[PDB]
Amino acid sequence: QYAPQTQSGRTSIVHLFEWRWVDIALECERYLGPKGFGGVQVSPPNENIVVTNPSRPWWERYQPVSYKLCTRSGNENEFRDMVTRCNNVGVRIYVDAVINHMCGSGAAAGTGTTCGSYCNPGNREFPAVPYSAWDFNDGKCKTASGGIESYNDPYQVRDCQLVGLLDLALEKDYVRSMIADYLNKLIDIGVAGFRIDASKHMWPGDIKAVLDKLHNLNTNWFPAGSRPFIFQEVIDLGGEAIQSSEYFGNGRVTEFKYGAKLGTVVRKWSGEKMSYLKNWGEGWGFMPSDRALVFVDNHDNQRGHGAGGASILTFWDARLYKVAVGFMLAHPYGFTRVMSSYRWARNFVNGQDVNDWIGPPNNNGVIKEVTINADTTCGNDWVCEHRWRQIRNMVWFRNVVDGQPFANWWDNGSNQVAFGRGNRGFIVFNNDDWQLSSTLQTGLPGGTYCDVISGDKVGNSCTGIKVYVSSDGTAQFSISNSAEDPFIAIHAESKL
Numbered sequence: 001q002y003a004p005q006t007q008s009g010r011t012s013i014v015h016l017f018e019w020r021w022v023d024i025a026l027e028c029e030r031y032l033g034p035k036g037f038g039g040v041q042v043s044p045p046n047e048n049i050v051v052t053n054p055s056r057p058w059w060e061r062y063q064p065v066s067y068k069l070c071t072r073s074g075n076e077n078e079f080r081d082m083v084t085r086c087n088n089v090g091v092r093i094y095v096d097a098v099i100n101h102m103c104g105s106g107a108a109a110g111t112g113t114t115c116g117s118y119c120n121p122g123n124r125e126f127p128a129v130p131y132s133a134w135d136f137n138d139g140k141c142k143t144a145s146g147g148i149e150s151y152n153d154p155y156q157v158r159d160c161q162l163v164g165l166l167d168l169a170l171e172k173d174y175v176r177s178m179i180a181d182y183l184n185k186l187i188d189i190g191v192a193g194f195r196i197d198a199s200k201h202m203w204p205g206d207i208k209a210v211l212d213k214l215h216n217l218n219t220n221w222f223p224a225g226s227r228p229f230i231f232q233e234v235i236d237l238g239g240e241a242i243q244s245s246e247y248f249g250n251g252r253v254t255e256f257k258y259g260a261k262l263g264t265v266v267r268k269w270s271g272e273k274m275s276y277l278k279n280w281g282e283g284w285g286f287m288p289s290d291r292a293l294v295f296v297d298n299h300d301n302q303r304g305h306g307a308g309g310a311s312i313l314t315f316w317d318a319r320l321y322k323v324a325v326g327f328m329l330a331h332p333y334g335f336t337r338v339m340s341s342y343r344w345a346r347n348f349v350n351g352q353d354v355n356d357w358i359g360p361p362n363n364n365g366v367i368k369e370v371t372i373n374a375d376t377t378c379g380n381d382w383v384c385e386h387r388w389r390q391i392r393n394m395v396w397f398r399n400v401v402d403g404q405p406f407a408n409w410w411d412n413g414s415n416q417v418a419f420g421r422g423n424r425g426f427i428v429f430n431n432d433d434w435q436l437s438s439t440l441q442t443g444l445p446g447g448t449y450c451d452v453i454s455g456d457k458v459g460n461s462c463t464g465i466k467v468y469v470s471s472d473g474t475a476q477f478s479i480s481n482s483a484e485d486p487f488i489a490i491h492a493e494s495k496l
């Protein structure tokens with residue numbers, strides 16, 4: 001449950017949010033495999049309700065109508081093909097499992113669904129599953145409205161309707177079994193694990209009863225007896241009635257404190273300074289590292305009013321975002337997820353983006369292909385953060401240093417900091433309003449190393465900055481506060 005089941009030596013996964021299956025299959029072969037990425041989190045592959053107002057928002061995919069593999073991302077054959085092709089080049093697939101709920105109780109009866117299944121939400125009728133009224137928590141929820149009226153009552157949070165979505169009666173074996181049958185189909189196709197959407201809104205024990213029914217992973221690609229990787233989306237920033245620790249027995253848990261706190265520090269809000277990161281990890285009150293899934297932003301909070309609010313860093317804040325992602329990927333805490341986004345027209349009305357609904361790049365509702373430019377960037381308004389040099393190379397850094405302890409911390413008492421990972425990597429940041437020019441102990445063997453932030457190692461040369469490390473392990477680092485990327489990273493495989 002806790003082990004990611006990635007190929008040995010691969011330590012991150014990337015969220016290819018709203019990507020089509022054919023494009024992911026390609027990306028696996030041409031890019032993710034060769035560049036050392038461990039896996040891909042995909043958008044929900046099951047049939048969802050079509051929302052015409054607003055027009056085809058990203059969030060319609062969090063409103064299931066059946067477990068047919070038929071969505072704007074593709075059909076079943078395309079899904080299967082993607083899973084086979086990615087696994088064959090060493091890149092795992094993790095599915096976003098939406099299992100707390102079906103679609104909104106107020107949606108109209110009809111075949112306005114991505115595969116044309118019929119449903120009647122007002123009658124709690126989903127014949128393509130099938131579910132009926134006795135399969136939902138209407139009778140269990142104790143609130144007048146039927147929704148969640150207070151988050152300090154765990155019963156409401158779990159048994160009542162989250163934003164009007166029909167809440168499945170997860171204590172029933174029939175419902176557990178229908179969900180296990182869906183997940184097991186996906187496991188047998190070859191998926192390696194699951195993000196469990198909205199885990200806070202389920203009882204830990206009901207999730208457990210579902211997980212206990214799940215097949216071992218497909219032995220074409222995995223060792224016998226392998227269990228699916230589970231990570232559960234529980235938003236817990238502290239001082240709530242439900243805690244992330246209630247879910248430790250099922251798998252890993254999203255640690256939303258991580259991005260919220262890191263964003264605040266990198267931005268230097270609320271008195272925070274990079275030097276306070278000396279004890280980052282359990283030292284800041286985070287869950288145990290072996291239970292954590294971490295990330296700087298996710299698909300919801302990158303829109304600015306989710307867990308962490310305005311402090312969350314994103315591709316819109318490119319320069320500081322790269323700093324935060326860099327720090328994350330260098331630091332030993334947790335298992336790391338990298339985000340990959342699309343661009344949308346933000347429109348702020350009283351500190352609120354009213355276009356936060358907008359779905360992926362599309363032609364009249366049909367998702368656009370991901371095009372690759374000569375310079376290796378993406379077109380068609382896909383951001384492709386995972387292809388930015390600074391991020392891809394820090395993904396490799398994490399692979400190279402995997403297993404090495406945190407070591408050789410230095411700081412200037414403010415926002416210049418550095419640390420290493422055993423004797424295989426070192427990274428230095430300047431987030432202060434003045435120059436960094438200091439000779440630091442790196443822990444690395446003497447030699448000449450390419451900085452993998454400003455460039456790459458190509459044959460027996462570096463395309464960016466080079467760092468000469470003395471025989472005693474020291475080197476001089478000079479970073480202006482006006483540097484494009486105000487940090488430098490060197491590792492064992494960037495050595496000339």
Ligand SMILES: OC[C@H]1O[C@H](OC[C@H]2O[C@H](O[C@H]3[C@H](O)[C@@H](O)[C@@H](O[C@H]4[C@H](O)[C@@H](O)[C@H](O)O[C@@H]4CO)O[C@@H]3CO)[C@H](O)[C@@H](O)[C@@H]2O[C@H]2O[C@H](CO)[C@@H](O[C@H]3O[C@H](CO)[C@@H](O)[C@H](O)[C@H]3O)[C@H](O)[C@H]2O)[C@H](O)[C@@H](O)[C@@H]1O
Binds near residue numbers: 107
């Ligand atoms: O009821 C039919 C209804 O269907 C549509 O959707 C309704 C609501 O869905 C959308 O919300 C999406 C979230 O923005 C998105 O973040 C995600 O949610 C995930 C969340 O971020 C994450 O943390 C987590 O753990 O999982 C969540 C889901 O997986 O996906 C969401 C669902 O698609 C809209 O953004 C949201 O605002 C819509 O809600 C609006 O209408 C509903 C229903 O009236 C309101 O609920 C309230 O009124 C009800 C009246 O009885 C009451 O029962 C309920 O308890 C009240 O809370 C809601 O507050 C309001 O904003 C269409 O949007 C809608 O037009 C259709 O009628």
Ligand SMILES: OC[C@H]1O[C@H](O[C@H]2[C@H](O)[C@@H](O)[C@@H](O[C@H]3[C@H](O)[C@@H](O)[C@@H](O[C@H]4[C@H](O)[C@@H](O)[C@@H](O)O[C@@H]4CO)O[C@@H]3CO)O[C@@H]2CO)[C@H](O)[C@@H](O)[C@@H]1O
Binds near residue numbers: 053055
């Ligand atoms: O200008 C501000 C607002 O405009 C945008 O939303 C639009 C939609 O995109 C339009 O198509 C239209 O909505 C239609 C809708 O397409 C149609 O289905 C119907 O709605 C049904 C609904 O589907 C059904 O599930 C049930 O609940 O009953 C509804 C019937 O009332 O009728 C709609 C029009 O009444 O209009 C809206 C404009 O409000 C924009 O995306 C919004 O974000 C924005 O607020």
Ligand SMILES: OC[C@H]1O[C@@H](O)[C@H](O)[C@@H](O)[C@@H]1O
Binds near residue numbers: 170205
């Ligand atoms: O299985 C765990 C159980 O926790 C209980 O507190 C809930 O009331 C029940 O619905 C759930 O099944």
Ligand SMILES: [Ca+2]
Binds near residue numbers: 201
């Ligand atoms: Ca629930």
Ligand SMILES: [Cl-]
Binds near residue numbers: 233254
């Ligand atoms: Cl998440």
